[PDB]
Write a protein that binds this DNA or RNA. Structure first.
Lengths: 136, 79, 58, 116, 94
RNA sequence: GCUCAACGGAUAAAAGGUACUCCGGGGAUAACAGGCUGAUACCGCCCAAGAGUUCAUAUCGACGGCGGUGUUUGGCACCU
RNA sequence: UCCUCCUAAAGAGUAACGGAGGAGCACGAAGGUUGGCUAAUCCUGGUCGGACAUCAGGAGGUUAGUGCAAUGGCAUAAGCC
RNA sequence: CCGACUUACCAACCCGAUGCAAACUGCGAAUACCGGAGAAUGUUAUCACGGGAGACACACGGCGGGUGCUAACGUCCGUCGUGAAGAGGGAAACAACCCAGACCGCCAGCUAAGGUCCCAAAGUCAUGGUUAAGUGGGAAACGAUGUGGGAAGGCCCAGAC
RNA sequence: GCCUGGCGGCCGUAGCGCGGUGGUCCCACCUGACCCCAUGCCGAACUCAGAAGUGAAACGCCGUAGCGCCGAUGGUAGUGUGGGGUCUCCCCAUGCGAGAGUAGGGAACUGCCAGGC
């Protein structure tokens, strides 16, 4: 899921992935799944980690998804040559920089949150870490 | 389908650079396309048609921000 | 006035054209060439522009 | 606001006279009085002024802020302008119409010698 | 009590701050709105253990520079984005 | 007085076939094969919701993830 | 063939069977000048006005508008009479 | 019934918090570019006119990008370097990478990159550590009481594991 | 010295909100309109002639930070040159160095002329 309902433009440039992430703090919840390493987080991987989390916590507590797949990724079909325009939009990713809190959790004990975050981290491609809400 | 068309211009920015000793009528800012990025107020009023800002006296270009709207003006001051 | 000694130490082969022109403005030709240049912030700026090649005796 | 609308009407001609470097004879009109000010083209210093609130003008008039008062003020400001020795000024409506007291003041300045 | 021993900063900048973080110390600043701000460096492991103590932000702290006791309070903390460690703290004079 | 719109406009005026073909060239450029790459293919591993009567891992393993090989269909056009 | 934006790296320029859209006109007023004026939208009372026709009041400030794409403009309005 | 809840599901506005954008900007560099002044340096390097060209198949590497799969010794641009059209030393062998630009001769010395056990010229060099796999001398997710270093944390001579 | 009006300079440390304050000095509302003139009706507005009334609205001044606005120091991001790990991104030397935040500032300042006390 998690494809945007509308877009201003259908396709984007490929671009490059940024230096460091905005949104490093745990804001809404009490525990978080912070990102250690770059990559692009596909909407399918985001949904799979969300299901692993939600079933691990048995649909108790509240889960925030702090990233959104707003970048369309185009892929050329099989056995077509180079050129002839840009390819068709196939799937949506979120660009992840180190330090991006990907998910947030509240209303659960910390060890159950760690187990749910571990089961989500097993589905995500990038390396993640467990973070806790800190006052500054 | 197909979407590969584009237009052409070959200058779009200023030529006078606030030390530039522009004489007579030199285009200080040609193909600004519009009187709003730069206004001409030092040597009378430039901005003839297509809003090309041009000098009216022999002198140095002057860039300045005046007015309540913080608008940028090109002036010509004598050497 | 006071003068300083500027000695080239590396080659000018794969360098930028601005770096080559800075060595031309300094007066350095060979990889061991030393010049006596009068001490000036402009000469110091040329040295800082190409400082990975030159060596300065103060 | 009537004063803000008057300033919006005046602003176009005021900037046009500023860009030409013209010495401006500006007029201000109230229900009670009328004012005339010849102002140098830098716009900061006033060369000549003649007002209806000035007692020397106001004692000769049956009512301040009349068309006769406007003619007296225009004659006075043109007399002081020609006494100062400046000429070839440009008239500013200051947002008013060219009608009634404003027209009478400009006509009196033209008759007394201030040429536009 | 929360006493931090701190040293004044001989050099400021990104290179000097990264040299501090390579030498396992980190920069900090003290300002009060009444006199000139003071740039200091802190021992990172000690100030980390005081971070892990949860009463670090509520109460009044004591920074010792040159034997002078300064009563401060932690305004904000700049943390490393994906590591536990911390880069910079600003202290308001209390 | 120009959809001289193939818009610096060959001429007022012009479509096709060639496996019956022919010449001058090209590995500047395709088919086979080699090369680079590995999307695809094939093989393997990580997590484990499940089903397997109870029991995740005897056996299979969803949602997802990471590789390996050169190995299919491809991409490129480097050799001829 | 021509125009607008991005690609395009804060001067100009800059390619692809790159990503998006338009033009082959219109107007004797929709030009000139002088004088005047200021929108979109929202909340309310009243004739089919109903959620939106027209009044009156308040909020708002250019979120409107430009003969037609897009960009840059525009209140001294280049927007409306 | 001129309605005493506004729903245990949601499509709008506003407020508070959190991100994203090549075709977003209430902000905003470094560089680059344009102009002026000044010194030093450069065989006027600069400009104009005239005689003669060639060339208009580029390649790779670094940086910035579009496209492709953040594939290609892929393709298309900007920019610099090298090759083209540049030998010599290094990377085993190697157009384009690193160092360096060969007028000629020398059985002279000093260095760059890269190296110093033998092939093969030069440290079986000095001090302090680390690793035990031949890692060095190819490869990820993930897994493990491998083994050093550091800052802390529990239980504990009222007897800790 | 105070207050008011006109024309500027500078353009949110300049404005908005809330509260208070001023009157036939000045300015606003205000009186009347056949006449100088105008409303696609409108003496709303634009004008003209001005016995009375109030400053209520507007406007000016003062206080208040509630919102706008300005805004350090330090750090971070980026980046020119040189060098280095690099598979797609960074690190070191050096030079420049934001934006957002933080402390804080902030209820503008000033020039010419005219009028009253």
């Amino acid at each position: 899921m998690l494809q945007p309902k509308r877009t201003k433009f259908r396709k984007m440039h490929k671009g490059r992935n940024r230096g460091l992430a905005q949104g490093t703090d745990v804001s809404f919840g009490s525990f978080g799944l912070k990102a250690v390493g770059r990559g692009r987080l596909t909407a399918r991987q985001i949904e799979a980690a969300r299901r692993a989390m939600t079933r691990a916590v048995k649909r108790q507590g509240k889960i925030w998804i702090r990233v959104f797949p707003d970048k369309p990724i185009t892929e050329k079909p099989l056995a077509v040559r180079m050129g002839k325009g840009k390819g068709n939009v196939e799937y949506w990713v979120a660009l992840i920089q180190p330090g991006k809190v990907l998910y947030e959790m509240d209303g659960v004990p910390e060890e159950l949150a760690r187990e749910a975050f571990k089961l989500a981290a097993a589905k995500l491609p990038i390396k993640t870490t467990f973070v806790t809400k800190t006052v500054m | 389908g197909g979407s590969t068309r584009n237009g052409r211009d070959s200058e779009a920015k200023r030529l006078g650079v606030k030390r530039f000793g522009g004489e007579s009528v030199l285009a200080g800012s040609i193909i600004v396309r519009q009187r709003g990025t730069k206004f001409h107020a030092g040597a009378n009023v430039g901005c003839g048609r297509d809003h090309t800002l041009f000098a009216k006296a022999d002198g140095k270009v002057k860039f300045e921000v005046k007015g309540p709207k913080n608008r940028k003006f090109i002036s010509i001051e004598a050497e | 006035a006071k003068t300083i000694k500027i000695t080239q130490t590396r080659s000018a082969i794969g360098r930028l054209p601005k770096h080559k022109a800075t060595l031309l403005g300094l007066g350095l030709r060979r990889i061991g060439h030393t010049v006596e240049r009068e001490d000036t912030p402009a000469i110091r700026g040329m040295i800082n522009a190409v400082s990975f090649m030159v060596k300065v005796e103060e | 606001d009537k004063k803000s609308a008057r300033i919006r009407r005046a602003t176009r001609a005021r900037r046009k006279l500023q860009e030409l470097g013209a010495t401006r004879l500006v007029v201000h009109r109230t229900p009670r009085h009328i004012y005339a000010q010849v102002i140098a083209p830098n716009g900061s210093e006033v060369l000549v002024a003649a007002s209806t609130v000035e007692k020397a003008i106001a004692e000769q008039l049956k009512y301040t802020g009349n068309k006769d008062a406007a003619a007296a003020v225009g004659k006075a400001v043109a007399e002081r302008a020609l006494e100062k020795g400046i000429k070839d000024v440009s008239f500013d409506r200051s947002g008013f119409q060219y009608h009634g007291r404003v027209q009478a003041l400009a006509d009196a300045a033209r008759e007394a010698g201030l040429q536009f | 009590m929360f006493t931090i021993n701190a040293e004044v900063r001989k050099e400021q900048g990104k290179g000097a701050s990264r040299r501090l973080r390579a030498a396992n110390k980190f920069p900090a600043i003290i300002y009060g709105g009444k006199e000139a701000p003071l740039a200091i460096e802190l021992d990172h492991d000690k100030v980390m253990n005081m971070q892990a103590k949860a009463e670090f932000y509520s109460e009044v702290l004591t920074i010792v520079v040159d034997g002078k006791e300064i009563k401060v309070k932690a305004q904000d903390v700049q943390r490393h984005p994906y590591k536990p460690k911390l880069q910079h703290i600003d202290f308001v004079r209390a």
